[PDB]
Design a protein around this ligand. Structure first.
Ligand SMILES: CCCCCCCCCCCCCCCCCC(=O)OC[C@H](COP(=O)(O)OCCN)OC(=O)CCCCCCCCCCCCCCCCC
Lengths: 93, 57
């Protein structure tokens, strides 16, 4: 057994009215260093994990697409379009 | 089953055959679409002139 006598005493008897004021500026400085090392360092890894599948597996993110057919309108010099909904699928393996 | 070379030969030939059938379809459809537009335009002109209908806006 470890002789934890002094630590046991510390745990049993601790002040219950002692507190220290914290310099807001230094607290903010440390926290914003933490944010700097999160957004700009771990953000790279997080964004890679989130996006790389969306780059190498794009077809699963855009399920439905549209296709068009066109006809002329000679007497008005216009073009008439008919649309169609399709399931976005692979093509020409 | 067959070597990959023969499989790609078949793939190319089938692509060509599908394109040929699409060529037939395109030719027939274009011809009949031109005829259809002419007929419909003439029908609307005759209708308006004959007084059968009034086309406004
Ligand atoms: C559509 C509407 C969108 C609206 C968005 C609004 C965004 C608001 C963002 C507010 C940011 C406030 C940043 C405040 C930083 C305060 C830093 C500070 O108090 O500490 C100063 C400290 C000085 O450094 P020191 O070397 O000790 O020099 C002594 C100088 N007296 O400085 C340091 O030690 C370095 C501090 C580094 C700070 C890093 C900041 C990183 C910010 C990341 C933001 C990410 C936002 C992502 C949004 C995505 C949107 C798609």
């Amino acid at each position: 057994m470890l002789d934890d006598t002094k630590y046991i005493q510390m745990a049993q008897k601790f002040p219950r009215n002692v507190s220290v004021q914290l310099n807001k500026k230094l607290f903010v400085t440390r926290t914003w260093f933490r944010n700097y090392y999160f957004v700009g360092v771990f953000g790279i890894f997080a964004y890679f994990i989130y996006n790389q599948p969306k780059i190498f597996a794009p077809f699963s993110g855009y399920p439905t697409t549209v296709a068009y057919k066109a006809q002329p309108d000679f007497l008005n010099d216009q073009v008439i379009f008919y649309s169609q909904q399709r399931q976005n699928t692979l093509k020409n393996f | 089953m067959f070597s990959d070379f023969n499989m790609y030969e078949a793939k190319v030939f089938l692509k060509a055959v599908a394109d040929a059938q699409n060529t037939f379809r395109q030719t027939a459809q274009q011809e009949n679409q031109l005829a259809r537009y002419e007929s419909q335009s003439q029908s609307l002109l005759n209708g308006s002139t004959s007084g059968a209908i009034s086309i406004t806006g």
